[PDB]
């Protein structure tokens, strides 16, 4: 069952992700012949570690921007600024009560 499923997943991954042309597309018998034997696992690598250029740039930009944003140094700077905001707000409220 893994042979035909991996063949169809490989065909869909070639068509949808890499944008492989129809004349360069692997047919179903081609995918079955490639995936038999040692080809069942290595293309199983390609469907989970190899993407299109746009997808790789997407993932790399997403991580390299969010991890920059989700750094604990950015968080501690933001909470210190919020602490300054809370502190002069406390100044205003305490002076109003005074």
């Amino acid at each position: 069952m893994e042979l035909a499923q991996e063949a169809r997943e490989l065909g869909c991954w070639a068509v949808e992700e890499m944008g492989v042309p129809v004349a360069a597309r692997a047919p179903e018998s081609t995918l079955r012949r490639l995936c038999l034997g040692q080809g069942a696992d290595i293309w199983a690598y390609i469907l989970q570690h190899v993407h299109s250029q746009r997808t790789v740039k997407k993932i790399r930009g997403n991580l390299l921007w969010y991890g920059h944003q989700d750094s604990p140094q950015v968080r501690r700077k933001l909470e210190l600024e919020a602490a300054v905001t809370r502190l002069r707000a406390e100044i205003q409220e305490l002076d109003q009560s005074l």
Binding site: V20, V50, L64
Partner: protein, 101 residues
């Protein structure tokens, strides 16, 4: 001509751990078909190492997808990349003395 050598080089570009132990002549049965070759030539000549992500990047993006945060695609991706590349120069951020102030 051993057409499997380009396949071995391509599978080395994708960072396969067992690609060093694979021989080009052992996969020459893959390249003997014309309908095989129609995909094999394009995979050899149009896929590089830039199309491949590391395991750390893949698991980090998996945790990011599990976090429910929006994914930077298209315009947001280009904006984030442009900001990071412009910040690749001399930037005065992350100062600990202004933190102490």
């Amino acid at each position: 001509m051993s057409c499997g050598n380009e396949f071995v080089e391509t599978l080395k570009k994708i960072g396969y751990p067992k690609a060093d132990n694979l021989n080009g002549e052992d996969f020459d049965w893959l390249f003997e078909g014309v309908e095989d070759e129609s995909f094999l030539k394009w995979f050899c000549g149009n896929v590089n190492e830039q199309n491949v992500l590391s395991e750390r990047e893949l698991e980090a993006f998996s945790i990011l997808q599990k976090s429910g945060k929006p994914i930077l695609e298209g315009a947001a991706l280009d904006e984030a990349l442009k900001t990071c590349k412009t910040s690749d120069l001399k930037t005065p951020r992350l100062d600990d003395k202004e933190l102490e102030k």
